[PDB]
Symmetry: D2
Subunit: 184 residues, 4 copies
């Protein structure tokens, strides 16, 4: 029933981090990309939430993924430099945990995302849209619960149970009221 | 604010005046998107004929909508489809005993409004909420939606008030829908 | 250098026919389909050429192929019925040899077509067009010499050497002057 | 009736007034479609810089055209590309020493006219006349032509009269073009 069964390797490499190390925390999980249309908006909002609400129990987790218009083509070792010097650029550094690149859809999906997709089969704000241009669906198999683009969001309660999914178009910062409800 | 299937109409395969589904009030409807050269063409057409024959007198109406969006398995023209069924597959003189409509799309911006409606009303098959397509190259319509019909011969069961009741996947046999139909006829 | 190295099984099944059995004949080879936009035009013209020029040394050979808009979905055992009763319909029967369904492009291509494509890398009448809708290119790998659609044509001389390739838009019957030159 | 490359112009990466290639008469041109996050980005950019540095004084001009049609390997905006090269890949402070133009398409109906021309003039790479794409899902432009650029970093060598002389595939190293360039410079 919970995300605590799963682990992932930090972007820099090294030992996997178990999500069970985050028991009691509210988690905001996003699949991320460095050259997407919402890279700047979502990374800056993720930083803002982590800074403001981290001390109260929020942990933001980002999972780089190259399945959506190949908008994460850089290697693991290149991503922080892209964020700092290209987009957002201007010295930007994430203040939350990034993991190694993975897949979120198809047979190669990281098990955490297979789990999240099945637990919350469609975004709360957009139950219907999957992809406008079918040429951009290039993973296999394709499922009705698949992540549609960069920066979908999954909100997980302090018991590790996925609570709500938000689409590519639902701004990260607009999840704050739902996070604050869980914190208090 | 919720429509029923009776809002919609479709042209018979032979052409001519649209038939409004509103004329079918009181009937239980089994609606399928069909194809003439699909892996389940024989099984579903034979089973649809069986249900129509046996349960028609008690209020079942089976409605088939040819569609070429799934492996291009309905490439024949409207005027060719009955010949394909009769002489090719199933062949052997086979004739549908239920209503077929003109070829249409079920997915994407060009979808017939009846299917856009059914998909929204029943957003995933009751028996398989997750599978959409194994080979992504076979998803060729636009836009793509989570509620899209996945292959030839999905099934929609509609009550005698026009309300969609249940959706069944491409793998769920037509004949296995009989108990759900019987419950509505009763 | 010649097509005589290759064999194919007749549509009805049974022992392969070696193309070496056709030494001395002019060959017109087409990839065919039963539900294509030029099915009627090309099948009727193929019959006409076989009837008129067969006695003088022409052999027409058709290779059903489902790689182009899946326009050959019928099984081998179904194709003649489709031609007779659906399209062209009206009792139509090919008067030339049809073979079992095969692929002409990609790693699974019948070796005859791999050979023909390499020998004559682009149609004589259209060196450039391959596909308008890229979603219809679904074989692998993709090569510059690939057959573009149903009913490309390959004209082979009486020595078995491929002489000329013709595109999907070059009518079968318009190959007659080139055939007649080789016959005489 | 045959054009030369001098018929065409392109806007510098930084923007502003189109540069006509006609201003380059007398120069040997090496034209490449480029990308910042490709498997040969480091190799080709480093080798292009080397050729430009060594053979520039003798008449070589290297011209790079960013293009996002191949695995979306040029997703960065025009205003981001130099930063990606400097700080990401190759990184380490790398700066091109040759002219880059604004992002464009090389294949399909939207292709920059220079590439539509080059493709027709030299319809297949001299070293690989046959390969176009291994994974068909990566062919996403329209229409598709037999002469299409197959991946990032194809190369076109143009003589000092503007006539395209030779095309080289995505796999043929930039530095391995040097002998052909030297022959034209001589």
């Amino acid at each position: 029933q919970s995300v605590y069964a799963f682990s992932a390797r930090p972007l820099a490499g090294g030992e996997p981090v178990s999500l069970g190390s985050l028991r009691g925390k509210v988690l905001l999980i996003e699949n991320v990309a460095s050259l997407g249309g919402t890279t700047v908006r979502d990374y800056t909002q993720m930083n803002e939430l982590q800074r403001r609400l981290g001390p109260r129990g929020l942990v933001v987790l980002g999972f780089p993924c190259n399945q959506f218009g190949h908008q994460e083509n850089a290697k693991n070792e290149e991503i922080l430099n892209s964020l700092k010097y290209v987009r957002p650029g201007g010295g930007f550094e994430p203040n939350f945990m990034l993991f190694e690149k993975c897949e979120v859809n198809g047979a190669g999906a990281h098990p955490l995302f297979a789990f999240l997709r099945e637990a919350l089969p469609a975004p709360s704000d957009d139950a219907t849209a999957l992809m406008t241009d079918p040429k951009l669906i290039t993973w296999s198999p394709v499922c009705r619960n698949d992540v549609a683009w960069n920066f979908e969001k999954f909100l997980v309660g302090p018991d590790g149970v996925p609570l709500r999914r938000y689409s590519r178009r639902f701004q990260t910062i607009d999840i704050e009221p739902d996070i604050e409800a869980l914190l208090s």
